Ligand binder design. Structure first.
Ligand SMILES: *CCC(=O)N1CCN(c2ncnc3c(F)c(-c4ccccc4C(F)(F)F)c(Cl)cc23)CC1
Ligand SMILES: Nc1nc2c(ncn2[C@@H]2O[C@H](COP(=O)(O)OP(=O)(O)O)[C@@H](O)[C@H]2O)c(=O)[nH]1
Ligand SMILES: [Mg+2]
Length: 170
């Protein structure tokens, strides 16, 4: 079959994981998406001339560490680490999401992209430089997005695919 990429969107409640996912899948902004709905969406795309199937898991529900979740998360090939630029705690939480990915993958080299969402909002509390420095320390890209306007959304997911390709070449 055609190439597939298993992508996982992670980050604290309310950062815009679901809004980002629906923007990628359906090309419009959803104001309300139930925080208890965790689901995956597949979409056929062409990136750098390669046709692939993106299988995107939008994580949700509760903070719990079920066996299903670990196994589930283990199958992820790349991860979007999403915070919101107006929520400092969500940015501080990124360390947790990175470590948990590192724990379940048993690897220091997992495709990830740091995503600073809600870039449309004026009430910024997390400096772009701060995010850039963190991303550089992790050795990963940083992309600013707005699920509201769709700024950076394709770039975020497509950049993650490119990171997966880089990983697969090694
Ligand atoms: C508001 C609902 C929502 O969007 N979610 C609820 C909280 N939930 C969550 N919270 C805290 N830690 C999480 C976590 F560590 C994982 C996880 C588990 C196992 C391996 C990796 C990961 C990680 F996401 F990469 F961090 C998950 Cl799946 C969810 C966690 C998710 C968001
Ligand atoms: N202004 C703005 N609001 C957003 C953006 N992304 C998500 N939201 C809103 O923030 C809230 C949480 O979004 P949601 O997608 O449910 O976040 P999740 O809990 O990480 O899945 C919702 O009310 C969304 O409408 C964005 O880029 N800009
Ligand atoms: Mg959600």
């Amino acid at each position: 079959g055609m190439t597939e990429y298993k992508l996982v969107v992670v980050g604290a409640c309310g950062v815009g994981k679901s809004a980002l996912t629906i923007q990628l899948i359906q090309n419009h902004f959803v104001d309300e998406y139930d925080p208890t709905i965790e689901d995956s969406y597949r979409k056929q795309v062409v990136i750098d001339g390669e046709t692939s199937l993106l299988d995107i898991l939008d994580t949700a529900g509760q903070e719990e560490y079920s066996a299903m979740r670990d196994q589930y998360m283990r199958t992820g090939e790349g991860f979007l680490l999403v915070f919101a630029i107006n929520n400092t705690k969500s940015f501080e939480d990124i360390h947790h999401y990175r470590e948990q990915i590192k724990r379940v993958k048993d690897s220091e080299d997992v495709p990830m992209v740091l995503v600073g969402n809600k870039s449309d909002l004026p009430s910024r509390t997390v400096d772009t430089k701060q995010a850039q420095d963190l991303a550089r320390s992790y050795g990963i890209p940083f992309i600013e997005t707005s699920a509201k306007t769709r700024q950076g959304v394709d770039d975020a997911f497509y950049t993650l695919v490119r990171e997966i390709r880089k990983h697969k070449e090694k």
